[PDB]
């Protein structure tokens, strides 16, 4: 294909809607905004929560609890992701990073108990779930805590 026969992907290009140009297209004199409204004038928007002076929803609703500066969100991984590694291999958070299974080590790696695993591994992770531990001991792998 040369330049003088350029074809885009059909349905990937859309013409712009030039409002307020003539009457045949529609959106003519009023430019598609109705009549005489507060919204119909320039800058005429209302605040996004504002509902006509009626005391809004977030104000009618009370506040909830806190958050803490100390929050250890553990890097989630389930057992199905463990099947990618070969038999009899050692897995460590660093090797998890190089394999890209987890994109951010962050507070710490923690395995969780969904998926079927039938492989022998030496898994090194900070936190375990009880189902994960019984699953890896059923498979024959060793779950030791870092």
């Amino acid at each position: 294909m040369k330049l003088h026969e350029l074809k885009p992907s059909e349905g990937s290009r859309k013409t712009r809607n030039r409002v307020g140009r003539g009457i045949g297209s529609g959106n003519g004199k009023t430019a598609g905004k109705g009549h005489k409204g507060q919204n119909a004038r320039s800058g005429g928007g209302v605040r996004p929560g504002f509902e006509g002076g009626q005391m809004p929803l977030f104000q009618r609703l009370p506040k909830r609890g806190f958050t803490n500066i100390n929050r250890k969100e553990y890097a989630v991984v389930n057992l199905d992701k463990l099947n990618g590694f070969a038999e009899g291999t050692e897995v460590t958070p660093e090797l998890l990073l190089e394999t890209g299974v987890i994109s951010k080590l962050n507070a710490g790696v923690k395995i969780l108990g969904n998926g079927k695993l039938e492989k022998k591994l030496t898994v090194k992770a900070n936190k375990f779930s009880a189902s994960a531990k019984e699953a890896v001991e059923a498979a024959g792998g060793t779950a030791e805590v870092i």
Partner: protein, 205 residues
């Protein structure tokens, strides 16, 4: 990916095997189109500024009182409908570039090279050595190689002497083996390559 190899004086040699993953890929028309549009927009620099109402050296005072005057109600002398100027929503200085994924751009460049392969305008010229920067020598070289319309030459190492000579033509330009793009490849309609740059771009891709 089995294009015949040619010499300097138009002599031909044994054909060269080419990478299938780079030169035999079925091209993607939409991706090639978007890659064209991408750097086609990126080349333009878009410097254009036109004076908005607030900055047109004047305005200021109210020209006359609101009521009690036969004239229409009116604000500053510099105003949009006013003759003196003040334009609204004019062109503003801004950037006309964005970015595409690495996979997309590599797929696009593979697509265009493979397209050139399948319509057979690739001519490979190994060991392109010229002892002088004179232009009529490579002009006779191109006439022997039988190219009439535009073309593009890629040679990586001999660029320091070829680049002075070949820059004479308006429609013909050298490029390094690194600097392969889409506009130069599509527009020049006849891609001249050397085998060293073939392997270089081959391992790059």
């Amino acid at each position: 990916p089995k294009v015949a190899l040619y010499n300097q004086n138009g002599s031909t040699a044994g054909d060269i095997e080419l990478n299938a993953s780079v030169f035999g890929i079925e091209p993607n028309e939409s991706v090639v189109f978007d890659a064209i549009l991408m750097q086609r927009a990126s080349l333009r620099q878009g410097t254009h500024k036109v004076k908005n109402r607030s900055e047109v050296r004047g305005g200021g005072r109210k020209p006359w009182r609101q009521k009690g005057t036969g004239r229409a109600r009116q604000g500053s002398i510099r105003s949009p409908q006013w003759r003196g100027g003040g334009v609204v929503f004019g062109p503003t200085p801004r950037s006309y570039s964005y970015k595409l994924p690495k996979k997309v751009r590599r797929l696009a460049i593979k697509s265009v090279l493979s397209s050139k392969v399948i319509d057979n305008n690739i001519i490979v010229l190994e060991d392109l050595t010229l002892d002088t920067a004179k232009t009529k020598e490579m002009a006779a070289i191109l006439k022997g190689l039988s190219v009439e319309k535009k073309a593009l030459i890629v040679t990586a190492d001999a660029n320091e002497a070829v680049a002075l000579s070949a820059r004479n033509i308006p429609g013909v330009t050298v490029v390094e083996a690194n600097g392969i793009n889409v506009l130069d490849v599509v527009n020049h309609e006849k891609l001249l390559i050397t085998k060293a740059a073939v392997e270089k771009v081959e391992e790059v891709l």
